PDB file of all heavy atoms in Angstrom:
ATOM      1  N   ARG A  49      89.450 158.955 135.078  1.00 56.59           N
ATOM      2  CA  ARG A  49      90.037 157.626 135.172  1.00 56.59           C
ATOM      3  C   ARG A  49      91.374 157.767 135.847  1.00 56.59           C
ATOM      4  O   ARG A  49      92.213 158.606 135.520  1.00 56.59           O
ATOM      5  CB  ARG A  49      90.181 156.983 133.788  1.00 56.59           C
ATOM      6  CG  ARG A  49      90.268 155.478 133.898  1.00 56.59           C
ATOM      7  CD  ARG A  49      90.252 154.899 132.465  1.00 56.59           C
ATOM      8  NE  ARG A  49      91.533 155.226 131.817  1.00 56.59           N
ATOM      9  CZ  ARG A  49      92.035 154.557 130.814  1.00 56.59           C
ATOM     10  NH1 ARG A  49      91.388 153.485 130.301  1.00 56.59           N
ATOM     11  NH2 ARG A  49      93.191 154.865 130.275  1.00 56.59           N
ATOM     12  N   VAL A  50      91.542 156.981 136.908  1.00 58.47           N
ATOM     13  CA  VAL A  50      92.687 157.029 137.763  1.00 58.47           C
ATOM     14  C   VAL A  50      93.602 155.750 137.618  1.00 58.47           C
ATOM     15  O   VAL A  50      94.821 155.789 137.863  1.00 58.47           O
ATOM     16  CB  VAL A  50      92.189 157.328 139.202  1.00 58.47           C
ATOM     17  CG1 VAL A  50      91.250 156.256 139.737  1.00 58.47           C
ATOM     18  CG2 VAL A  50      93.269 157.680 140.148  1.00 58.47           C
ATOM     19  N   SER A  51      92.990 154.622 137.214  1.00 56.93           N
ATOM     20  CA  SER A  51      93.646 153.325 137.001  1.00 56.93           C
ATOM     21  C   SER A  51      92.901 152.490 136.051  1.00 56.93           C
ATOM     22  O   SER A  51      91.659 152.587 136.015  1.00 56.93           O
ATOM     23  CB  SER A  51      93.820 152.575 138.331  1.00 56.93           C
ATOM     24  OG  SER A  51      94.442 153.371 139.320  1.00 56.93           O
ATOM     25  N   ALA A  52      93.585 151.661 135.267  1.00 55.57           N
ATOM     26  CA  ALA A  52      92.986 150.771 134.247  1.00 55.57           C
ATOM     27  C   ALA A  52      93.767 149.449 134.133  1.00 55.57           C
ATOM     28  O   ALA A  52      94.974 149.464 134.416  1.00 55.57           O
ATOM     29  CB  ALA A  52      92.886 151.427 132.885  1.00 55.57           C
ATOM     30  N   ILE A  53      93.059 148.352 133.861  1.00 54.51           N
ATOM     31  CA  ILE A  53      93.608 147.039 133.794  1.00 54.51           C
ATOM     32  C   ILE A  53      93.080 146.244 132.576  1.00 54.51           C
ATOM     33  O   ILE A  53      91.931 146.370 132.252  1.00 54.51           O
ATOM     34  CB  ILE A  53      93.380 146.272 135.145  1.00 54.51           C
ATOM     35  CG1 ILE A  53      94.228 144.941 135.221  1.00 54.51           C
ATOM     36  CG2 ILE A  53      91.883 145.999 135.451  1.00 54.51           C
ATOM     37  CD1 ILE A  53      94.462 144.445 136.671  1.00 54.51           C
ATOM     38  N   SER A  54      93.927 145.458 131.915  1.00 53.78           N
ATOM     39  CA  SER A  54      93.552 144.623 130.775  1.00 53.78           C
ATOM     40  C   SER A  54      92.775 143.355 131.278  1.00 53.78           C
ATOM     41  O   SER A  54      92.627 143.175 132.495  1.00 53.78           O
ATOM     42  CB  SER A  54      94.807 144.181 129.983  1.00 53.78           C
ATOM     43  OG  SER A  54      95.812 143.525 130.817  1.00 53.78           O
ATOM     44  N   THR A  55      92.159 142.627 130.356  1.00 49.60           N
ATOM     45  CA  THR A  55      91.309 141.447 130.641  1.00 49.60           C
ATOM     46  C   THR A  55      91.886 140.403 131.597  1.00 49.60           C
ATOM     47  O   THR A  55      91.132 139.886 132.450  1.00 49.60           O
ATOM     48  CB  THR A  55      90.883 140.799 129.326  1.00 49.60           C
ATOM     49  OG1 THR A  55      92.048 140.297 128.616  1.00 49.60           O
ATOM     50  CG2 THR A  55      90.025 141.713 128.413  1.00 49.60           C
ATOM     51  N   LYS A  56      93.202 140.066 131.464  1.00 47.93           N
ATOM     52  CA  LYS A  56      93.811 139.141 132.405  1.00 47.93           C
ATOM     53  C   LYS A  56      94.795 139.823 133.348  1.00 47.93           C
ATOM     54  O   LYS A  56      95.570 139.163 134.021  1.00 47.93           O
ATOM     55  CB  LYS A  56      94.514 137.988 131.692  1.00 47.93           C
ATOM     56  CG  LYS A  56      93.596 137.106 130.811  1.00 47.93           C
ATOM     57  CD  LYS A  56      94.326 136.106 129.944  1.00 47.93           C
ATOM     58  CE  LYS A  56      93.427 135.034 129.404  1.00 47.93           C
ATOM     59  NZ  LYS A  56      94.206 133.963 128.705  1.00 47.93           N
ATOM     60  N   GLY A  57      94.773 141.140 133.371  1.00 46.43           N
ATOM     61  CA  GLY A  57      95.680 141.948 134.220  1.00 46.43           C
ATOM     62  C   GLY A  57      97.154 141.960 133.833  1.00 46.43           C
ATOM     63  O   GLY A  57      97.984 142.409 134.640  1.00 46.43           O
ATOM     64  N   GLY A  58      97.447 141.596 132.601  1.00 43.97           N
ATOM     65  CA  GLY A  58      98.858 141.616 132.086  1.00 43.97           C
ATOM     66  C   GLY A  58      99.335 143.061 131.869  1.00 43.97           C
ATOM     67  O   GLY A  58     100.567 143.283 131.817  1.00 43.97           O
ATOM     68  N   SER A  59      98.425 144.029 131.769  1.00 41.87           N
ATOM     69  CA  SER A  59      98.742 145.406 131.486  1.00 41.87           C
ATOM     70  C   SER A  59      97.868 146.312 132.339  1.00 41.87           C
ATOM     71  O   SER A  59      96.632 146.134 132.436  1.00 41.87           O
ATOM     72  CB  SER A  59      98.499 145.740 129.997  1.00 41.87           C
ATOM     73  OG  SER A  59      98.730 147.132 129.760  1.00 41.87           O
ATOM     74  N   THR A  60      98.532 147.267 133.017  1.00 41.81           N
ATOM     75  CA  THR A  60      97.943 148.246 133.897  1.00 41.81           C
ATOM     76  C   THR A  60      98.366 149.688 133.473  1.00 41.81           C
ATOM     77  O   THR A  60      99.432 149.865 132.886  1.00 41.81           O
ATOM     78  CB  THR A  60      98.281 147.957 135.385  1.00 41.81           C
ATOM     79  OG1 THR A  60      99.677 147.925 135.659  1.00 41.81           O
ATOM     80  CG2 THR A  60      97.599 146.717 135.916  1.00 41.81           C
ATOM     81  N   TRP A  61      97.509 150.633 133.834  1.00 41.66           N
ATOM     82  CA  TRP A  61      97.744 152.046 133.533  1.00 41.66           C
ATOM     83  C   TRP A  61      97.392 152.845 134.861  1.00 41.66           C
ATOM     84  O   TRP A  61      96.454 152.418 135.547  1.00 41.66           O
ATOM     85  CB  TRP A  61      96.847 152.516 132.375  1.00 41.66           C
ATOM     86  CG  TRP A  61      96.940 154.000 132.159  1.00 41.66           C
ATOM     87  CD1 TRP A  61      97.876 154.716 131.502  1.00 41.66           C
ATOM     88  CD2 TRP A  61      96.082 155.006 132.790  1.00 41.66           C
ATOM     89  NE1 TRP A  61      97.688 156.060 131.576  1.00 41.66           N
ATOM     90  CE2 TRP A  61      96.572 156.268 132.381  1.00 41.66           C
ATOM     91  CE3 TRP A  61      94.951 154.943 133.646  1.00 41.66           C
ATOM     92  CZ2 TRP A  61      96.001 157.479 132.827  1.00 41.66           C
ATOM     93  CZ3 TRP A  61      94.361 156.151 134.038  1.00 41.66           C
ATOM     94  CH2 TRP A  61      94.873 157.394 133.597  1.00 41.66           C
ATOM     95  N   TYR A  62      98.119 153.902 135.122  1.00 42.34           N
ATOM     96  CA  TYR A  62      97.862 154.762 136.274  1.00 42.34           C
ATOM     97  C   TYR A  62      98.002 156.197 135.952  1.00 42.34           C
ATOM     98  O   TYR A  62      98.906 156.568 135.213  1.00 42.34           O
ATOM     99  CB  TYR A  62      98.793 154.439 137.433  1.00 42.34           C
ATOM    100  CG  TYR A  62      98.702 153.074 137.958  1.00 42.34           C
ATOM    101  CD1 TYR A  62      99.492 152.032 137.461  1.00 42.34           C
ATOM    102  CD2 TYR A  62      97.744 152.713 138.916  1.00 42.34           C
ATOM    103  CE1 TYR A  62      99.385 150.727 137.927  1.00 42.34           C
ATOM    104  CE2 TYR A  62      97.620 151.417 139.412  1.00 42.34           C
ATOM    105  CZ  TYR A  62      98.420 150.410 138.891  1.00 42.34           C
ATOM    106  OH  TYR A  62      98.302 149.129 139.370  1.00 42.34           O
ATOM    107  N   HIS A  63      97.081 157.015 136.507  1.00 45.90           N
ATOM    108  CA  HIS A  63      97.151 158.470 136.400  1.00 45.90           C
ATOM    109  C   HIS A  63      98.460 158.876 137.147  1.00 45.90           C
ATOM    110  O   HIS A  63      98.798 158.229 138.165  1.00 45.90           O
ATOM    111  CB  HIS A  63      95.885 159.060 137.053  1.00 45.90           C
ATOM    112  CG  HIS A  63      95.781 160.535 136.931  1.00 45.90           C
ATOM    113  ND1 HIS A  63      96.333 161.364 137.900  1.00 45.90           N
ATOM    114  CD2 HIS A  63      95.282 161.288 135.963  1.00 45.90           C
ATOM    115  CE1 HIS A  63      96.112 162.571 137.474  1.00 45.90           C
ATOM    116  NE2 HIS A  63      95.478 162.617 136.314  1.00 45.90           N
ATOM    117  N   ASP A  64      99.133 159.890 136.643  1.00 45.66           N
ATOM    118  CA  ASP A  64     100.453 160.329 137.220  1.00 45.66           C
ATOM    119  C   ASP A  64     100.465 160.632 138.697  1.00 45.66           C
ATOM    120  O   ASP A  64     101.451 160.294 139.383  1.00 45.66           O
ATOM    121  CB  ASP A  64     101.040 161.530 136.445  1.00 45.66           C
ATOM    122  CG  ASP A  64     101.506 161.168 135.009  1.00 45.66           C
ATOM    123  OD1 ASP A  64     102.040 160.097 134.843  1.00 45.66           O
ATOM    124  OD2 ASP A  64     101.343 162.064 134.126  1.00 45.66           O
ATOM    125  N   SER A  65      99.356 161.166 139.234  1.00 46.26           N
ATOM    126  CA  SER A  65      99.242 161.481 140.673  1.00 46.26           C
ATOM    127  C   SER A  65      99.030 160.308 141.609  1.00 46.26           C
ATOM    128  O   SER A  65      99.017 160.494 142.831  1.00 46.26           O
ATOM    129  CB  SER A  65      98.092 162.506 140.859  1.00 46.26           C
ATOM    130  OG  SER A  65      96.837 161.895 140.637  1.00 46.26           O
ATOM    131  N   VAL A  66      98.838 159.059 141.070  1.00 45.04           N
ATOM    132  CA  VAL A  66      98.615 157.873 141.892  1.00 45.04           C
ATOM    133  C   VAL A  66      99.617 156.712 141.600  1.00 45.04           C
ATOM    134  O   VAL A  66      99.658 155.755 142.362  1.00 45.04           O
ATOM    135  CB  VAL A  66      97.120 157.344 141.791  1.00 45.04           C
ATOM    136  CG1 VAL A  66      96.135 158.482 142.082  1.00 45.04           C
ATOM    137  CG2 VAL A  66      96.877 156.700 140.434  1.00 45.04           C
ATOM    138  N   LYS A  67     100.430 156.881 140.586  1.00 45.44           N
ATOM    139  CA  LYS A  67     101.516 155.960 140.181  1.00 45.44           C
ATOM    140  C   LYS A  67     102.463 155.727 141.402  1.00 45.44           C
ATOM    141  O   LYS A  67     102.774 156.659 142.136  1.00 45.44           O
ATOM    142  CB  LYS A  67     102.315 156.522 138.992  1.00 45.44           C
ATOM    143  CG  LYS A  67     102.780 155.463 138.027  1.00 45.44           C
ATOM    144  CD  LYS A  67     103.400 156.031 136.740  1.00 45.44           C
ATOM    145  CE  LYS A  67     102.375 156.478 135.690  1.00 45.44           C
ATOM    146  NZ  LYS A  67     102.964 157.390 134.728  1.00 45.44           N
ATOM    147  N   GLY A  68     102.772 154.442 141.669  1.00 48.26           N
ATOM    148  CA  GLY A  68     103.595 154.057 142.771  1.00 48.26           C
ATOM    149  C   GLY A  68     102.819 153.864 144.080  1.00 48.26           C
ATOM    150  O   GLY A  68     103.291 153.136 144.956  1.00 48.26           O
ATOM    151  N   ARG A  69     101.702 154.518 144.248  1.00 44.47           N
ATOM    152  CA  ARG A  69     100.903 154.467 145.447  1.00 44.47           C
ATOM    153  C   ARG A  69      99.598 153.562 145.282  1.00 44.47           C
ATOM    154  O   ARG A  69      99.238 152.858 146.276  1.00 44.47           O
ATOM    155  CB  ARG A  69     100.539 155.861 145.898  1.00 44.47           C
ATOM    156  CG  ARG A  69     101.676 156.878 145.895  1.00 44.47           C
ATOM    157  CD  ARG A  69     101.181 158.343 145.991  1.00 44.47           C
ATOM    158  NE  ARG A  69     100.036 158.332 146.952  1.00 44.47           N
ATOM    159  CZ  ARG A  69      98.824 158.762 146.671  1.00 44.47           C
ATOM    160  NH1 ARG A  69      98.556 159.453 145.584  1.00 44.47           N
ATOM    161  NH2 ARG A  69      97.879 158.612 147.594  1.00 44.47           N
ATOM    162  N   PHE A  70      99.008 153.534 144.127  1.00 44.64           N
ATOM    163  CA  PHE A  70      97.749 152.760 143.872  1.00 44.64           C
ATOM    164  C   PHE A  70      98.088 151.531 143.053  1.00 44.64           C
ATOM    165  O   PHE A  70      99.039 151.484 142.266  1.00 44.64           O
ATOM    166  CB  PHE A  70      96.732 153.621 143.128  1.00 44.64           C
ATOM    167  CG  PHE A  70      95.993 154.696 143.840  1.00 44.64           C
ATOM    168  CD1 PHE A  70      96.586 155.342 144.967  1.00 44.64           C
ATOM    169  CD2 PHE A  70      94.733 155.099 143.462  1.00 44.64           C
ATOM    170  CE1 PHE A  70      95.865 156.354 145.625  1.00 44.64           C
ATOM    171  CE2 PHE A  70      94.063 156.128 144.119  1.00 44.64           C
ATOM    172  CZ  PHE A  70      94.642 156.763 145.183  1.00 44.64           C
ATOM    173  N   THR A  71      97.338 150.414 143.280  1.00 47.66           N
ATOM    174  CA  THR A  71      97.484 149.117 142.566  1.00 47.66           C
ATOM    175  C   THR A  71      96.089 148.601 142.192  1.00 47.66           C
ATOM    176  O   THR A  71      95.269 148.308 143.093  1.00 47.66           O
ATOM    177  CB  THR A  71      98.360 148.086 143.275  1.00 47.66           C
ATOM    178  OG1 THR A  71      99.593 148.702 143.687  1.00 47.66           O
ATOM    179  CG2 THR A  71      98.673 146.872 142.382  1.00 47.66           C
ATOM    180  N   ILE A  72      95.833 148.531 140.885  1.00 46.94           N
ATOM    181  CA  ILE A  72      94.609 147.918 140.346  1.00 46.94           C
ATOM    182  C   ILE A  72      95.005 146.461 140.074  1.00 46.94           C
ATOM    183  O   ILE A  72      96.070 146.194 139.533  1.00 46.94           O
ATOM    184  CB  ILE A  72      94.076 148.671 139.075  1.00 46.94           C
ATOM    185  CG1 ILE A  72      92.706 148.135 138.658  1.00 46.94           C
ATOM    186  CG2 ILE A  72      95.095 148.676 137.888  1.00 46.94           C
ATOM    187  CD1 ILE A  72      92.032 148.893 137.519  1.00 46.94           C
ATOM    188  N   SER A  73      94.166 145.539 140.518  1.00 46.40           N
ATOM    189  CA  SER A  73      94.394 144.085 140.320  1.00 46.40           C
ATOM    190  C   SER A  73      93.011 143.490 140.097  1.00 46.40           C
ATOM    191  O   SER A  73      92.031 144.136 140.449  1.00 46.40           O
ATOM    192  CB  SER A  73      95.170 143.458 141.483  1.00 46.40           C
ATOM    193  OG  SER A  73      94.365 143.495 142.663  1.00 46.40           O
ATOM    194  N   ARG A  74      92.938 142.312 139.508  1.00 48.26           N
ATOM    195  CA  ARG A  74      91.664 141.638 139.322  1.00 48.26           C
ATOM    196  C   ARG A  74      91.799 140.121 139.570  1.00 48.26           C
ATOM    197  O   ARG A  74      92.885 139.591 139.337  1.00 48.26           O
ATOM    198  CB  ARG A  74      91.078 141.927 137.909  1.00 48.26           C
ATOM    199  CG  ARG A  74      91.992 141.374 136.768  1.00 48.26           C
ATOM    200  CD  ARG A  74      91.533 141.897 135.433  1.00 48.26           C
ATOM    201  NE  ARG A  74      90.158 141.474 135.066  1.00 48.26           N
ATOM    202  CZ  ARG A  74      89.469 142.001 134.091  1.00 48.26           C
ATOM    203  NH1 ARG A  74      89.958 143.060 133.415  1.00 48.26           N
ATOM    204  NH2 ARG A  74      88.270 141.602 133.822  1.00 48.26           N
ATOM    205  N   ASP A  75      90.744 139.523 140.103  1.00 49.92           N
ATOM    206  CA  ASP A  75      90.700 138.054 140.386  1.00 49.92           C
ATOM    207  C   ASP A  75      89.551 137.527 139.474  1.00 49.92           C
ATOM    208  O   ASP A  75      88.396 137.547 139.923  1.00 49.92           O
ATOM    209  CB  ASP A  75      90.474 137.885 141.898  1.00 49.92           C
ATOM    210  CG  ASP A  75      90.331 136.439 142.323  1.00 49.92           C
ATOM    211  OD1 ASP A  75      90.393 135.511 141.467  1.00 49.92           O
ATOM    212  OD2 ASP A  75      90.278 136.197 143.565  1.00 49.92           O
ATOM    213  N   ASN A  76      89.818 137.096 138.240  1.00 51.43           N
ATOM    214  CA  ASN A  76      88.845 136.619 137.270  1.00 51.43           C
ATOM    215  C   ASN A  76      88.046 135.380 137.687  1.00 51.43           C
ATOM    216  O   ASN A  76      86.918 135.255 137.314  1.00 51.43           O
ATOM    217  CB  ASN A  76      89.482 136.399 135.858  1.00 51.43           C
ATOM    218  CG  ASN A  76      89.875 137.715 135.234  1.00 51.43           C
ATOM    219  OD1 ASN A  76      89.705 138.799 135.787  1.00 51.43           O
ATOM    220  ND2 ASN A  76      90.460 137.679 134.035  1.00 51.43           N
ATOM    221  N   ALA A  77      88.652 134.577 138.527  1.00 52.28           N
ATOM    222  CA  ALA A  77      88.003 133.374 139.079  1.00 52.28           C
ATOM    223  C   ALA A  77      86.825 133.834 139.937  1.00 52.28           C
ATOM    224  O   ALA A  77      85.809 133.152 139.991  1.00 52.28           O
ATOM    225  CB  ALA A  77      88.950 132.539 139.835  1.00 52.28           C
ATOM    226  N   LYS A  78      86.873 135.024 140.533  1.00 54.43           N
ATOM    227  CA  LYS A  78      85.900 135.604 141.394  1.00 54.43           C
ATOM    228  C   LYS A  78      85.076 136.756 140.735  1.00 54.43           C
ATOM    229  O   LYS A  78      84.191 137.276 141.422  1.00 54.43           O
ATOM    230  CB  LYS A  78      86.401 136.029 142.757  1.00 54.43           C
ATOM    231  CG  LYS A  78      87.001 134.846 143.608  1.00 54.43           C
ATOM    232  CD  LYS A  78      87.340 135.360 145.000  1.00 54.43           C
ATOM    233  CE  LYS A  78      87.974 134.359 145.864  1.00 54.43           C
ATOM    234  NZ  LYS A  78      89.230 133.914 145.251  1.00 54.43           N
ATOM    235  N   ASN A  79      85.353 137.058 139.475  1.00 52.90           N
ATOM    236  CA  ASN A  79      84.667 138.187 138.721  1.00 52.90           C
ATOM    237  C   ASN A  79      84.805 139.438 139.512  1.00 52.90           C
ATOM    238  O   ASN A  79      83.927 140.297 139.507  1.00 52.90           O
ATOM    239  CB  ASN A  79      83.178 137.782 138.490  1.00 52.90           C
ATOM    240  CG  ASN A  79      82.599 137.970 137.110  1.00 52.90           C
ATOM    241  OD1 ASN A  79      83.346 138.013 136.121  1.00 52.90           O
ATOM    242  ND2 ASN A  79      81.315 138.081 137.009  1.00 52.90           N
ATOM    243  N   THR A  80      85.988 139.621 140.183  1.00 52.87           N
ATOM    244  CA  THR A  80      86.238 140.712 141.124  1.00 52.87           C
ATOM    245  C   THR A  80      87.462 141.564 140.666  1.00 52.87           C
ATOM    246  O   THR A  80      88.425 141.057 140.181  1.00 52.87           O
ATOM    247  CB  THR A  80      86.382 140.127 142.591  1.00 52.87           C
ATOM    248  OG1 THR A  80      85.175 139.521 142.884  1.00 52.87           O
ATOM    249  CG2 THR A  80      86.760 141.157 143.673  1.00 52.87           C
ATOM    250  N   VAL A  81      87.371 142.871 140.967  1.00 54.46           N
ATOM    251  CA  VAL A  81      88.435 143.855 140.648  1.00 54.46           C
ATOM    252  C   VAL A  81      88.691 144.606 141.953  1.00 54.46           C
ATOM    253  O   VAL A  81      87.800 144.830 142.749  1.00 54.46           O
ATOM    254  CB  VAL A  81      88.084 144.780 139.457  1.00 54.46           C
ATOM    255  CG1 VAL A  81      86.813 145.612 139.735  1.00 54.46           C
ATOM    256  CG2 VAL A  81      89.275 145.665 139.071  1.00 54.46           C
ATOM    257  N   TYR A  82      89.968 144.996 142.146  1.00 55.24           N
ATOM    258  CA  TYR A  82      90.389 145.723 143.362  1.00 55.24           C
ATOM    259  C   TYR A  82      91.147 147.009 143.044  1.00 55.24           C
ATOM    260  O   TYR A  82      91.764 147.131 141.979  1.00 55.24           O
ATOM    261  CB  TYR A  82      91.319 144.882 144.258  1.00 55.24           C
ATOM    262  CG  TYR A  82      90.741 143.593 144.732  1.00 55.24           C
ATOM    263  CD1 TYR A  82      91.115 142.377 144.221  1.00 55.24           C
ATOM    264  CD2 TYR A  82      89.852 143.589 145.816  1.00 55.24           C
ATOM    265  CE1 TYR A  82      90.607 141.156 144.714  1.00 55.24           C
ATOM    266  CE2 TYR A  82      89.311 142.412 146.303  1.00 55.24           C
ATOM    267  CZ  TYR A  82      89.653 141.159 145.751  1.00 55.24           C
ATOM    268  OH  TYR A  82      89.151 140.023 146.264  1.00 55.24           O
ATOM    269  N   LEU A  83      91.118 147.938 143.994  1.00 51.88           N
ATOM    270  CA  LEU A  83      91.960 149.132 144.001  1.00 51.88           C
ATOM    271  C   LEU A  83      92.585 149.223 145.374  1.00 51.88           C
ATOM    272  O   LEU A  83      91.921 149.427 146.339  1.00 51.88           O
ATOM    273  CB  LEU A  83      91.270 150.495 143.652  1.00 51.88           C
ATOM    274  CG  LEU A  83      92.206 151.684 143.504  1.00 51.88           C
ATOM    275  CD1 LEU A  83      93.182 151.551 142.325  1.00 51.88           C
ATOM    276  CD2 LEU A  83      91.410 152.974 143.343  1.00 51.88           C
ATOM    277  N   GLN A  84      93.916 149.017 145.443  1.00 51.76           N
ATOM    278  CA  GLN A  84      94.676 149.098 146.681  1.00 51.76           C
ATOM    279  C   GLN A  84      95.353 150.459 146.705  1.00 51.76           C
ATOM    280  O   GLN A  84      96.167 150.742 145.828  1.00 51.76           O
ATOM    281  CB  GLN A  84      95.738 147.967 146.748  1.00 51.76           C
ATOM    282  CG  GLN A  84      96.752 148.069 147.900  1.00 51.76           C
ATOM    283  CD  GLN A  84      96.097 148.039 149.259  1.00 51.76           C
ATOM    284  OE1 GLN A  84      95.323 147.117 149.569  1.00 51.76           O
ATOM    285  NE2 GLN A  84      96.367 149.064 150.077  1.00 51.76           N
ATOM    286  N   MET A  85      94.926 151.298 147.659  1.00 49.33           N
ATOM    287  CA  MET A  85      95.488 152.659 147.784  1.00 49.33           C
ATOM    288  C   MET A  85      96.353 152.763 148.983  1.00 49.33           C
ATOM    289  O   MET A  85      95.883 152.520 150.096  1.00 49.33           O
ATOM    290  CB  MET A  85      94.322 153.690 147.843  1.00 49.33           C
ATOM    291  CG  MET A  85      93.354 153.583 146.632  1.00 49.33           C
ATOM    292  SD  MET A  85      91.913 154.665 146.834  1.00 49.33           S
ATOM    293  CE  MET A  85      90.940 153.771 147.986  1.00 49.33           C
ATOM    294  N   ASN A  86      97.609 153.038 148.801  1.00 47.42           N
ATOM    295  CA  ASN A  86      98.638 153.235 149.858  1.00 47.42           C
ATOM    296  C   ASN A  86      99.021 154.676 149.895  1.00 47.42           C
ATOM    297  O   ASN A  86      98.809 155.389 148.948  1.00 47.42           O
ATOM    298  CB  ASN A  86      99.889 152.345 149.581  1.00 47.42           C
ATOM    299  CG  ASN A  86      99.694 150.861 149.749  1.00 47.42           C
ATOM    300  OD1 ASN A  86      98.948 150.342 150.556  1.00 47.42           O
ATOM    301  ND2 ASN A  86     100.517 150.108 149.028  1.00 47.42           N
ATOM    302  N   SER A  87      99.644 155.114 151.031  1.00 49.68           N
ATOM    303  CA  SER A  87     100.164 156.465 151.267  1.00 49.68           C
ATOM    304  C   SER A  87      99.114 157.539 150.780  1.00 49.68           C
ATOM    305  O   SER A  87      99.432 158.369 149.973  1.00 49.68           O
ATOM    306  CB  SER A  87     101.491 156.671 150.626  1.00 49.68           C
ATOM    307  OG  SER A  87     102.411 155.663 151.008  1.00 49.68           O
ATOM    308  N   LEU A  88      97.884 157.395 151.283  1.00 53.10           N
ATOM    309  CA  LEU A  88      96.753 158.323 150.917  1.00 53.10           C
ATOM    310  C   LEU A  88      97.028 159.732 151.358  1.00 53.10           C
ATOM    311  O   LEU A  88      97.601 159.961 152.428  1.00 53.10           O
ATOM    312  CB  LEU A  88      95.424 157.733 151.475  1.00 53.10           C
ATOM    313  CG  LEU A  88      94.799 156.568 150.631  1.00 53.10           C
ATOM    314  CD1 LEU A  88      93.835 155.743 151.503  1.00 53.10           C
ATOM    315  CD2 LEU A  88      94.043 157.080 149.446  1.00 53.10           C
ATOM    316  N   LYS A  89      96.677 160.670 150.468  1.00 50.39           N
ATOM    317  CA  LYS A  89      96.883 162.144 150.695  1.00 50.39           C
ATOM    318  C   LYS A  89      95.492 162.812 150.677  1.00 50.39           C
ATOM    319  O   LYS A  89      94.627 162.309 149.988  1.00 50.39           O
ATOM    320  CB  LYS A  89      97.729 162.725 149.526  1.00 50.39           C
ATOM    321  CG  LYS A  89      99.151 162.190 149.424  1.00 50.39           C
ATOM    322  CD  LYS A  89      99.697 162.440 148.044  1.00 50.39           C
ATOM    323  CE  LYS A  89     101.128 161.980 147.923  1.00 50.39           C
ATOM    324  NZ  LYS A  89     101.650 162.266 146.541  1.00 50.39           N
ATOM    325  N   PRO A  90      95.317 164.004 151.373  1.00 50.49           N
ATOM    326  CA  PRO A  90      93.997 164.656 151.308  1.00 50.49           C
ATOM    327  C   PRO A  90      93.472 164.891 149.859  1.00 50.49           C
ATOM    328  O   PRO A  90      92.292 164.852 149.639  1.00 50.49           O
ATOM    329  CB  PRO A  90      94.220 165.995 152.035  1.00 50.49           C
ATOM    330  CG  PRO A  90      95.347 165.683 152.987  1.00 50.49           C
ATOM    331  CD  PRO A  90      96.277 164.741 152.239  1.00 50.49           C
ATOM    332  N   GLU A  91      94.425 165.047 148.928  1.00 49.88           N
ATOM    333  CA  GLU A  91      94.246 165.227 147.481  1.00 49.88           C
ATOM    334  C   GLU A  91      93.446 164.041 146.834  1.00 49.88           C
ATOM    335  O   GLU A  91      92.897 164.196 145.732  1.00 49.88           O
ATOM    336  CB  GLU A  91      95.675 165.351 146.814  1.00 49.88           C
ATOM    337  CG  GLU A  91      95.730 165.629 145.332  1.00 49.88           C
ATOM    338  CD  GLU A  91      95.182 166.967 144.853  1.00 49.88           C
ATOM    339  OE1 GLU A  91      94.923 167.839 145.720  1.00 49.88           O
ATOM    340  OE2 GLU A  91      94.979 167.115 143.621  1.00 49.88           O
TER     341      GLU A  91
END
């Protein structure tokens, strides 16, 4: 597990190696979840 989000997205969790670079968000009106990955590394 690298990222986690609560039912309405009020609370997020990130693995230490992705904190500040990754963003988990969800759009409940669309039953959709996203992972936005910035500053990607070969790791």
Side-chain angles (χ1 to χ4, degrees):
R49 203 174 72 155
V50 63
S51 306
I53 191 160
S54 54
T55 61
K56 299 171 164 188
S59 177
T60 59
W61 174 82
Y62 297 93
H63 184 269
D64 290 323
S65 70
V66 307
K67 215 171 279 163
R69 313 165 39 235
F70 286 30
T71 311
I72 188 174
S73 65
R74 64 191 297 165
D75 179 357
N76 290 1
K78 296 189 186 59
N79 228 20
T80 299
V81 61
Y82 299 109
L83 185 66
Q84 171 61 52
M85 306 175 283
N86 289 328
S87 309
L88 282 157
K89 298 161 176 179
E91 183 65 13

